């Protein structure tokens, strides 16, 4: 209807992590129906980032999820009005990353406005020491709550042979009237977020694939 | 070859939940290689239980996981010596359910000893009001940490059309020498835990299926 097979993405992100201010601009593209996408991010203020960009990578696109088994698509249904998401991620070594995001659509271009505040990351930890090597793939739990889509996730940041676990609490809210929207049931969203390239803690490239599905286990 | 395609299970559980003391005995069976199993639980002291047995259901069998793609099997490798697990489950409405478990093997019978403490469950909540309808399927995150197997999970207790989220923190410890066991890498375990039958808050029947696997998403 309103979404095409090739979509452009423009993202503006502003934030402060452990007191360090930054701004990022991203241009990306993807296929929303096969659920694949990529983004080029330039840190336009606050470069070089004194912390691992990994913690900001999940703040950089829910319209690009391949929905299987007839699962209703909260995000694609939300257009032309668009949607927002709120998230807090708690890291098991103390760090906290809170974010709010606005998703709108203008022509062939998705427009993301992201605000980020991160606090209490340990000074000696892999995030502030910039010693992480990206994320493992993950499986978000997704479920309705009175017209709001809730998400819960466990993600694992790679630090050598070790994994730093964090816990994601997400709320996805449509700007469309609740009556014009078909809510999904309880389901899962597999997500594989990768960072193929980065340069000087100032330029980053992301690729992400996402699939909404039910458990593959038979119900007895 | 210590495990057979048909195994017996004997379980003894003792615990206190919101100040209510109880003991349970379980007899079960299953196929460890297809990863399927069932159990009959009788509350022998403290019946009828004044809380939902659902919160005790995940305390009742990791030898029965179907391992795909050559993922090493921490639990099956642990025999004949066996293993232990410990877990804390935090419910988003305040409840806490902690457990320690010992798993041994004698002949054709796996022997489980479980100790449980549950606290701070709200008097008005679905657990203490006994108004839950079992668990959704879930996907545990499993990864090594210096010979210990760690698990993290998000589970959802069904309360009508509502879901009460809880967060699981698990540690699995082999009694085998670290040198005689090959640790798996980061992977996932799909688990579907069901309660086909219950009676008088005193008799319960469980069925569980589990599969260890990697992400279904292609790695770009």
CSV table of C-alpha atoms in Angstrom, one decimal:
chain,number,residue,atom,x,y,z
A,1,UNK,CA,0.0,0.0,0.0
A,2,UNK,CA,2.3,2.8,1.3
A,3,UNK,CA,5.5,0.7,1.7
A,4,UNK,CA,7.6,-0.4,-1.3
A,5,UNK,CA,10.0,-3.2,-1.8
A,6,UNK,CA,13.0,-0.8,-1.5
A,7,UNK,CA,12.7,1.8,1.2
A,8,UNK,CA,15.1,4.6,2.1
A,9,UNK,CA,15.8,5.4,5.8
A,10,UNK,CA,16.9,8.7,7.4
A,11,UNK,CA,17.7,8.7,11.1
A,12,UNK,CA,18.7,11.5,13.5
A,13,UNK,CA,19.9,10.4,16.9
A,14,UNK,CA,20.9,12.6,19.8
A,15,UNK,CA,21.9,11.3,23.2
A,16,UNK,CA,24.1,11.3,26.2
A,17,UNK,CA,25.8,8.1,27.5
A,18,UNK,CA,27.7,8.4,30.9
A,19,UNK,CA,27.7,12.1,30.4
A,20,UNK,CA,29.1,12.0,26.9
A,21,UNK,CA,27.0,13.9,24.4
A,22,UNK,CA,26.7,12.8,20.8
A,23,UNK,CA,24.7,13.2,17.6
A,24,UNK,CA,24.4,10.6,14.8
A,25,UNK,CA,23.0,10.8,11.3
A,26,UNK,CA,22.1,7.6,9.5
A,27,UNK,CA,21.1,6.8,6.0
A,28,UNK,CA,19.8,3.3,5.2
A,29,UNK,CA,17.7,1.1,3.0
A,30,UNK,CA,15.9,-2.1,3.1
A,31,UNK,CA,13.2,-4.5,2.1
A,32,UNK,CA,10.4,-4.2,4.7
A,33,UNK,CA,8.6,-7.4,3.5
A,34,UNK,CA,11.5,-9.7,3.5
A,35,UNK,CA,12.6,-7.9,6.7
A,36,UNK,CA,16.2,-7.0,5.8
A,37,UNK,CA,17.9,-3.6,6.1
A,38,UNK,CA,21.2,-1.7,6.4
A,39,UNK,CA,22.3,1.6,7.6
A,40,UNK,CA,25.4,3.9,7.4
A,41,UNK,CA,25.8,6.0,10.6
A,42,UNK,CA,28.1,9.1,10.9
A,43,UNK,CA,28.7,10.5,14.4
A,44,UNK,CA,28.4,14.2,13.5
A,45,UNK,CA,29.0,15.5,17.1
A,46,UNK,CA,30.9,13.9,19.9
A,47,UNK,CA,33.2,11.9,17.7
A,48,UNK,CA,35.1,9.7,18.4
A,49,UNK,CA,32.6,8.0,20.7
A,50,UNK,CA,34.3,7.0,24.0
A,51,UNK,CA,32.1,3.9,24.3
A,52,UNK,CA,31.1,0.9,22.2
A,53,UNK,CA,28.5,1.9,19.5
A,54,UNK,CA,27.1,-1.6,20.0
A,55,UNK,CA,24.8,-0.2,22.8
A,56,UNK,CA,23.3,2.3,20.4
A,57,UNK,CA,22.9,-0.2,17.5
A,58,UNK,CA,19.5,-1.5,18.6
A,59,UNK,CA,18.3,2.1,18.7
A,60,UNK,CA,18.9,2.6,15.0
A,61,UNK,CA,13.7,-0.1,12.7
A,62,UNK,CA,10.6,-2.2,13.3
A,63,UNK,CA,9.0,-1.6,9.8
A,64,UNK,CA,11.5,-4.1,8.4
A,65,UNK,CA,10.2,-7.4,9.9
A,66,UNK,CA,9.2,-10.4,7.8
A,67,UNK,CA,5.9,-11.6,9.3
A,68,UNK,CA,5.2,-15.3,8.9
A,69,UNK,CA,2.1,-17.5,9.6
A,70,UNK,CA,-0.3,-14.6,9.1
A,71,UNK,CA,0.8,-12.7,12.2
A,72,UNK,CA,-0.6,-9.2,12.0
A,73,UNK,CA,2.0,-6.5,11.4
A,74,UNK,CA,1.5,-3.8,14.1
A,75,UNK,CA,4.2,-1.6,12.5
A,76,UNK,CA,3.2,-1.8,8.8
A,77,UNK,CA,-0.5,-1.3,9.9
A,78,UNK,CA,0.5,1.9,11.7
A,79,UNK,CA,1.1,3.9,8.5
A,80,UNK,CA,0.6,6.6,7.2
A,81,UNK,CA,0.4,7.9,10.8
A,82,UNK,CA,3.6,6.1,11.9
A,83,UNK,CA,4.5,4.9,15.4
A,84,UNK,CA,6.8,5.3,18.3
A,85,UNK,CA,8.8,3.0,20.5
A,86,UNK,CA,10.2,3.3,24.1
A,87,UNK,CA,12.8,1.1,25.5
A,88,UNK,CA,15.0,0.6,28.5
A,89,UNK,CA,17.9,-1.9,28.4
A,90,UNK,CA,19.5,-2.9,31.7
A,91,UNK,CA,23.0,-4.4,31.5
A,92,UNK,CA,23.9,-7.0,34.1
A,93,UNK,CA,27.1,-5.1,35.0
A,94,UNK,CA,25.0,-2.0,35.9
A,95,UNK,CA,24.7,0.0,32.7
A,96,UNK,CA,21.2,1.4,31.7
A,97,UNK,CA,20.3,2.6,28.2
A,98,UNK,CA,16.9,4.3,27.8
A,99,UNK,CA,15.6,5.5,24.4
A,100,UNK,CA,12.6,7.0,22.7
A,101,UNK,CA,12.1,6.8,19.0
A,102,UNK,CA,9.6,8.4,16.5
A,103,UNK,CA,9.0,6.7,13.2
A,104,UNK,CA,7.2,8.6,10.4
A,105,UNK,CA,6.9,8.1,6.6
A,106,UNK,CA,7.4,10.8,4.0
A,107,UNK,CA,7.1,9.5,0.4
A,108,UNK,CA,9.6,6.7,-0.1
A,109,UNK,CA,11.6,7.6,3.0
A,110,UNK,CA,11.2,6.4,6.6
A,111,UNK,CA,12.2,9.1,9.1
A,112,UNK,CA,13.5,8.1,12.5
A,113,UNK,CA,14.1,10.5,15.4
A,114,UNK,CA,15.9,8.9,18.3
A,115,UNK,CA,16.7,10.3,21.8
A,116,UNK,CA,19.1,8.3,24.0
A,117,UNK,CA,20.1,8.6,27.7
A,118,UNK,CA,22.6,6.0,29.1
A,119,UNK,CA,23.8,6.0,32.7
A,120,UNK,CA,25.8,4.0,35.3
A,121,UNK,CA,27.9,2.1,32.8
A,122,UNK,CA,30.9,0.9,34.7
A,123,UNK,CA,34.1,2.8,33.9
A,124,UNK,CA,36.1,-0.4,33.6
A,125,UNK,CA,33.4,-2.3,31.7
A,126,UNK,CA,33.5,-3.4,28.0
A,127,UNK,CA,31.1,-0.7,27.0
A,128,UNK,CA,33.1,2.3,28.3
A,129,UNK,CA,36.4,0.6,27.5
A,130,UNK,CA,35.0,0.0,24.0
A,131,UNK,CA,35.9,-3.7,24.0
A,132,UNK,CA,32.8,-5.3,22.6
A,133,UNK,CA,32.4,-7.3,19.3
A,134,UNK,CA,28.7,-6.9,18.5
A,135,UNK,CA,25.6,-8.8,19.5
A,136,UNK,CA,24.5,-12.4,19.3
A,137,UNK,CA,21.3,-13.1,17.5
A,138,UNK,CA,18.3,-12.8,19.8
A,139,UNK,CA,14.6,-13.7,20.1
A,140,UNK,CA,12.2,-11.0,21.4
A,141,UNK,CA,9.0,-12.0,23.1
A,142,UNK,CA,6.1,-9.8,21.8
A,143,UNK,CA,2.6,-9.5,23.1
A,144,UNK,CA,-0.4,-7.1,23.2
A,145,UNK,CA,-1.5,-5.0,26.2
A,146,UNK,CA,-4.6,-2.8,25.5
A,147,UNK,CA,-3.5,-1.7,22.0
A,148,UNK,CA,0.2,-1.3,22.9
A,149,UNK,CA,2.7,-3.9,21.7
A,150,UNK,CA,5.0,-5.0,24.5
A,151,UNK,CA,8.5,-6.5,23.9
A,152,UNK,CA,10.9,-8.3,26.3
A,153,UNK,CA,14.3,-9.6,25.2
A,154,UNK,CA,17.5,-11.0,26.5
A,155,UNK,CA,20.5,-9.9,24.4
A,156,UNK,CA,24.2,-10.9,24.8
A,157,UNK,CA,27.1,-8.5,23.9
A,158,UNK,CA,30.2,-10.3,22.8
A,159,UNK,CA,33.4,-9.6,24.7
A,160,UNK,CA,35.9,-12.2,23.6
A,161,UNK,CA,34.7,-15.6,24.8
A,162,UNK,CA,32.4,-13.9,27.4
A,163,UNK,CA,28.9,-12.6,27.0
A,164,UNK,CA,27.5,-9.5,28.8
A,165,UNK,CA,23.8,-10.0,29.2
A,166,UNK,CA,21.3,-7.2,29.0
A,167,UNK,CA,17.5,-7.2,29.4
A,168,UNK,CA,15.3,-5.2,27.1
A,169,UNK,CA,11.9,-3.7,28.0
A,170,UNK,CA,10.1,-2.2,25.0
A,171,UNK,CA,6.8,-0.5,24.3
A,172,UNK,CA,5.6,0.0,20.7
A,173,UNK,CA,2.7,2.5,20.3
A,174,UNK,CA,0.8,3.2,17.1
A,175,UNK,CA,-0.2,6.7,16.2
A,176,UNK,CA,-3.2,5.1,14.4
A,177,UNK,CA,-6.5,4.9,16.1
A,178,UNK,CA,-6.8,1.8,18.2
A,179,UNK,CA,-10.0,0.8,16.3
A,180,UNK,CA,-8.3,0.8,12.9
A,181,UNK,CA,-5.5,-1.6,14.0
A,182,UNK,CA,-5.5,-5.4,14.3
A,183,UNK,CA,-3.4,-6.5,17.3
A,184,UNK,CA,-1.2,-9.6,17.0
A,185,UNK,CA,-1.2,-12.3,19.6
A,186,UNK,CA,1.7,-13.5,21.7
A,187,UNK,CA,4.6,-14.3,19.4
A,188,UNK,CA,8.4,-14.0,18.9
A,189,UNK,CA,10.7,-11.9,16.7
A,190,UNK,CA,14.0,-13.3,15.8
A,191,UNK,CA,16.6,-10.5,15.2
A,192,UNK,CA,20.1,-10.7,13.9
A,193,UNK,CA,21.8,-7.3,14.2
A,194,UNK,CA,25.3,-7.1,12.7
A,195,UNK,CA,27.9,-4.4,12.3
A,196,UNK,CA,30.0,-5.3,9.2
A,197,UNK,CA,32.2,-2.2,9.4
A,198,UNK,CA,33.2,0.6,11.7
A,199,UNK,CA,35.9,3.3,11.4
A,200,UNK,CA,37.5,5.7,14.0
A,201,UNK,CA,34.6,5.4,16.4
A,202,UNK,CA,32.8,7.7,14.1
A,203,UNK,CA,31.4,5.7,11.1
A,204,UNK,CA,29.4,2.5,11.5
A,205,UNK,CA,27.6,0.2,9.1
A,206,UNK,CA,24.7,-2.0,10.3
A,207,UNK,CA,22.8,-4.8,8.8
A,208,UNK,CA,19.7,-6.3,10.4
A,209,UNK,CA,17.3,-9.1,9.6
A,210,UNK,CA,14.1,-9.8,11.6
A,211,UNK,CA,11.3,-12.4,11.4
A,212,UNK,CA,8.1,-12.5,13.4
A,213,UNK,CA,7.0,-16.1,14.1
A,214,UNK,CA,5.5,-18.6,16.5
A,215,UNK,CA,7.3,-21.3,18.4
A,216,UNK,CA,8.3,-24.1,16.0
A,217,UNK,CA,7.7,-26.6,18.8
A,218,UNK,CA,4.5,-28.7,18.4
A,219,UNK,CA,1.8,-28.1,21.0
A,220,UNK,CA,0.8,-31.4,22.6
B,1,UNK,CA,25.3,-45.3,26.4
B,2,UNK,CA,24.1,-44.7,30.0
B,3,UNK,CA,20.9,-43.2,28.7
B,4,UNK,CA,18.1,-45.2,27.0
B,5,UNK,CA,15.4,-44.0,24.7
B,6,UNK,CA,13.0,-44.5,27.6
B,7,UNK,CA,14.1,-43.1,30.9
B,8,UNK,CA,12.3,-43.1,34.3
B,9,UNK,CA,12.2,-40.0,36.5
B,10,UNK,CA,11.9,-39.7,40.3
B,11,UNK,CA,11.6,-36.3,41.9
B,12,UNK,CA,11.4,-35.0,45.4
B,13,UNK,CA,10.7,-31.3,46.0
B,14,UNK,CA,10.5,-29.4,49.2
B,15,UNK,CA,9.8,-25.7,49.6
B,16,UNK,CA,8.2,-22.7,51.1
B,17,UNK,CA,6.2,-20.2,49.0
B,18,UNK,CA,4.9,-17.0,50.7
B,19,UNK,CA,5.3,-18.8,54.0
B,20,UNK,CA,3.4,-22.0,52.9
B,21,UNK,CA,5.4,-25.1,53.4
B,22,UNK,CA,5.0,-28.0,51.0
B,23,UNK,CA,6.5,-31.3,49.8
B,24,UNK,CA,5.9,-32.9,46.4
B,25,UNK,CA,6.8,-36.2,44.8
B,26,UNK,CA,7.0,-36.8,41.1
B,27,UNK,CA,7.2,-39.8,38.8
B,28,UNK,CA,7.9,-39.2,35.2
B,29,UNK,CA,9.3,-40.6,32.0
B,30,UNK,CA,10.7,-39.5,28.7
B,31,UNK,CA,12.9,-39.8,25.6
B,32,UNK,CA,16.1,-37.7,26.2
B,33,UNK,CA,17.1,-37.8,22.6
B,34,UNK,CA,13.8,-36.6,21.1
B,35,UNK,CA,13.7,-34.3,24.1
B,36,UNK,CA,10.2,-35.1,25.3
B,37,UNK,CA,9.0,-36.0,28.7
B,38,UNK,CA,6.1,-36.1,31.2
B,39,UNK,CA,5.7,-36.1,35.0
B,40,UNK,CA,3.0,-36.8,37.6
B,41,UNK,CA,3.4,-34.7,40.7
B,42,UNK,CA,1.6,-35.3,44.0
B,43,UNK,CA,1.7,-32.7,46.7
B,44,UNK,CA,2.2,-34.9,49.8
B,45,UNK,CA,2.5,-32.2,52.4
B,46,UNK,CA,0.8,-28.8,52.3
B,47,UNK,CA,-2.1,-29.7,49.9
B,48,UNK,CA,-4.2,-28.0,48.6
B,49,UNK,CA,-1.6,-25.6,47.4
B,50,UNK,CA,-2.8,-22.0,48.0
B,51,UNK,CA,-0.9,-20.7,45.0
B,52,UNK,CA,-0.6,-21.6,41.3
B,53,UNK,CA,1.5,-24.7,40.7
B,54,UNK,CA,2.6,-23.1,37.5
B,55,UNK,CA,5.5,-21.3,39.4
B,56,UNK,CA,6.8,-24.7,40.4
B,57,UNK,CA,6.4,-26.3,37.1
B,58,UNK,CA,9.8,-25.2,35.7
B,59,UNK,CA,11.5,-26.6,38.7
B,60,UNK,CA,10.3,-30.2,37.9
B,61,UNK,CA,14.6,-31.9,33.7
B,62,UNK,CA,17.4,-30.8,31.4
B,63,UNK,CA,18.6,-34.3,30.3
B,64,UNK,CA,15.6,-34.3,27.9
B,65,UNK,CA,16.7,-31.8,25.3
B,66,UNK,CA,16.9,-32.6,21.6
B,67,UNK,CA,20.3,-31.2,20.5
B,68,UNK,CA,20.5,-30.2,16.8
B,69,UNK,CA,23.4,-29.2,14.6
B,70,UNK,CA,26.0,-31.0,16.7
B,71,UNK,CA,25.7,-28.7,19.7
B,72,UNK,CA,27.4,-30.4,22.6
B,73,UNK,CA,25.0,-31.6,25.3
B,74,UNK,CA,26.2,-30.3,28.6
B,75,UNK,CA,23.7,-32.4,30.6
B,76,UNK,CA,24.0,-35.8,28.8
B,77,UNK,CA,27.8,-35.5,28.9
B,78,UNK,CA,27.6,-35.0,32.7
B,79,UNK,CA,26.6,-38.6,33.4
B,80,UNK,CA,27.3,-40.9,35.2
B,81,UNK,CA,28.4,-38.1,37.6
B,82,UNK,CA,25.3,-36.0,37.1
B,83,UNK,CA,24.8,-32.3,37.6
B,84,UNK,CA,23.1,-29.5,39.5
B,85,UNK,CA,21.2,-26.4,38.6
B,86,UNK,CA,20.2,-23.2,40.4
B,87,UNK,CA,17.7,-20.6,39.3
B,88,UNK,CA,16.1,-17.4,40.3
B,89,UNK,CA,12.9,-16.3,38.6
B,90,UNK,CA,11.8,-12.7,39.1
B,91,UNK,CA,8.2,-11.8,38.3
B,92,UNK,CA,7.4,-8.3,37.1
B,93,UNK,CA,4.8,-7.9,39.9
B,94,UNK,CA,7.3,-8.6,42.6
B,95,UNK,CA,7.3,-12.4,43.1
B,96,UNK,CA,10.6,-14.2,43.5
B,97,UNK,CA,11.0,-17.9,43.0
B,98,UNK,CA,14.4,-19.4,43.7
B,99,UNK,CA,15.4,-23.1,43.4
B,100,UNK,CA,18.3,-25.4,43.7
B,101,UNK,CA,18.3,-28.9,42.2
B,102,UNK,CA,20.5,-32.0,42.2
B,103,UNK,CA,20.3,-34.5,39.2
B,104,UNK,CA,21.7,-38.0,39.6
B,105,UNK,CA,21.3,-41.2,37.6
B,106,UNK,CA,20.8,-44.7,39.0
B,107,UNK,CA,20.2,-47.5,36.5
B,108,UNK,CA,17.3,-46.4,34.3
B,109,UNK,CA,16.1,-43.7,36.7
B,110,UNK,CA,17.0,-40.0,36.9
B,111,UNK,CA,16.7,-38.8,40.5
B,112,UNK,CA,15.9,-35.1,41.2
B,113,UNK,CA,16.1,-33.3,44.5
B,114,UNK,CA,14.6,-29.8,44.4
B,115,UNK,CA,14.6,-27.1,47.1
B,116,UNK,CA,12.4,-24.1,46.5
B,117,UNK,CA,11.8,-20.7,48.2
B,118,UNK,CA,9.2,-18.2,46.9
B,119,UNK,CA,8.8,-14.8,48.4
B,120,UNK,CA,7.0,-11.4,48.0
B,121,UNK,CA,4.2,-12.7,45.7
B,122,UNK,CA,1.4,-10.1,45.9
B,123,UNK,CA,-1.6,-11.4,47.8
B,124,UNK,CA,-3.9,-10.1,45.0
B,125,UNK,CA,-1.8,-11.4,42.1
B,126,UNK,CA,-2.6,-14.3,39.8
B,127,UNK,CA,0.0,-16.6,41.5
B,128,UNK,CA,-1.5,-16.3,45.0
B,129,UNK,CA,-5.1,-16.0,43.7
B,130,UNK,CA,-4.3,-19.2,41.7
B,131,UNK,CA,-5.7,-17.7,38.4
B,132,UNK,CA,-3.1,-18.7,35.9
B,133,UNK,CA,-3.4,-21.0,32.8
B,134,UNK,CA,0.1,-22.2,32.3
B,135,UNK,CA,3.1,-20.9,30.4
B,136,UNK,CA,3.6,-19.7,26.8
B,137,UNK,CA,6.4,-21.5,24.9
B,138,UNK,CA,9.8,-19.8,25.5
B,139,UNK,CA,13.4,-19.7,24.1
B,140,UNK,CA,16.2,-19.8,26.6
B,141,UNK,CA,19.6,-18.2,25.9
B,142,UNK,CA,22.4,-20.6,26.9
B,143,UNK,CA,26.1,-19.9,27.0
B,144,UNK,CA,29.3,-21.0,28.7
B,145,UNK,CA,31.1,-19.2,31.5
B,146,UNK,CA,34.3,-21.1,32.6
B,147,UNK,CA,32.8,-24.6,32.6
B,148,UNK,CA,29.5,-23.5,34.0
B,149,UNK,CA,26.5,-23.3,31.7
B,150,UNK,CA,24.5,-20.1,32.0
B,151,UNK,CA,20.8,-19.6,31.0
B,152,UNK,CA,18.7,-16.6,30.7
B,153,UNK,CA,15.0,-16.6,29.8
B,154,UNK,CA,11.8,-14.5,29.5
B,155,UNK,CA,8.7,-16.5,30.3
B,156,UNK,CA,5.0,-15.4,30.2
B,157,UNK,CA,2.4,-16.8,32.6
B,158,UNK,CA,-1.0,-16.8,31.0
B,159,UNK,CA,-3.7,-15.0,33.0
B,160,UNK,CA,-6.7,-14.8,30.6
B,161,UNK,CA,-5.8,-12.6,27.7
B,162,UNK,CA,-3.1,-11.1,29.9
B,163,UNK,CA,0.6,-12.2,30.3
B,164,UNK,CA,2.6,-11.9,33.5
B,165,UNK,CA,6.3,-11.7,32.5
B,166,UNK,CA,9.1,-13.2,34.5
B,167,UNK,CA,12.8,-13.4,34.1
B,168,UNK,CA,14.9,-16.5,34.6
B,169,UNK,CA,18.6,-16.6,35.7
B,170,UNK,CA,19.9,-20.1,35.6
B,171,UNK,CA,23.3,-21.8,36.3
B,172,UNK,CA,23.9,-25.5,35.4
B,173,UNK,CA,27.0,-27.1,36.9
B,174,UNK,CA,28.4,-30.5,35.9
B,175,UNK,CA,29.8,-32.9,38.5
B,176,UNK,CA,32.1,-34.2,35.7
B,177,UNK,CA,35.7,-33.0,35.6
B,178,UNK,CA,36.0,-29.9,33.4
B,179,UNK,CA,38.5,-31.8,31.2
B,180,UNK,CA,36.2,-34.6,30.3
B,181,UNK,CA,33.4,-32.4,29.0
B,182,UNK,CA,33.2,-30.2,25.9
B,183,UNK,CA,31.2,-27.0,26.5
B,184,UNK,CA,28.7,-25.8,23.9
B,185,UNK,CA,28.9,-22.3,22.4
B,186,UNK,CA,26.2,-19.7,22.6
B,187,UNK,CA,22.8,-21.2,21.5
B,188,UNK,CA,19.1,-21.3,22.2
B,189,UNK,CA,16.8,-23.8,23.8
B,190,UNK,CA,13.1,-23.8,22.7
B,191,UNK,CA,11.0,-25.1,25.6
B,192,UNK,CA,7.2,-25.8,25.6
B,193,UNK,CA,6.1,-26.7,29.1
B,194,UNK,CA,2.4,-27.8,29.4
B,195,UNK,CA,0.2,-28.9,32.3
B,196,UNK,CA,-2.4,-31.2,30.7
B,197,UNK,CA,-4.1,-32.1,34.0
B,198,UNK,CA,-4.5,-30.9,37.5
B,199,UNK,CA,-6.8,-31.8,40.4
B,200,UNK,CA,-7.6,-30.3,43.8
B,201,UNK,CA,-4.4,-28.2,43.9
B,202,UNK,CA,-2.7,-31.5,44.8
B,203,UNK,CA,-2.2,-33.6,41.7
B,204,UNK,CA,-0.5,-32.2,38.6
B,205,UNK,CA,0.6,-33.6,35.2
B,206,UNK,CA,3.3,-32.0,33.1
B,207,UNK,CA,4.5,-32.5,29.6
B,208,UNK,CA,7.6,-30.8,28.2
B,209,UNK,CA,9.5,-30.6,24.9
B,210,UNK,CA,12.9,-28.9,24.5
B,211,UNK,CA,15.2,-28.4,21.5
B,212,UNK,CA,18.7,-26.9,21.5
B,213,UNK,CA,19.5,-25.0,18.3
B,214,UNK,CA,21.1,-22.0,16.7
B,215,UNK,CA,19.3,-19.0,15.4
B,216,UNK,CA,17.2,-19.7,12.4
B,217,UNK,CA,18.3,-16.3,10.8
B,218,UNK,CA,21.0,-16.4,8.2
B,219,UNK,CA,24.3,-14.7,9.1
B,220,UNK,CA,25.1,-12.0,6.5
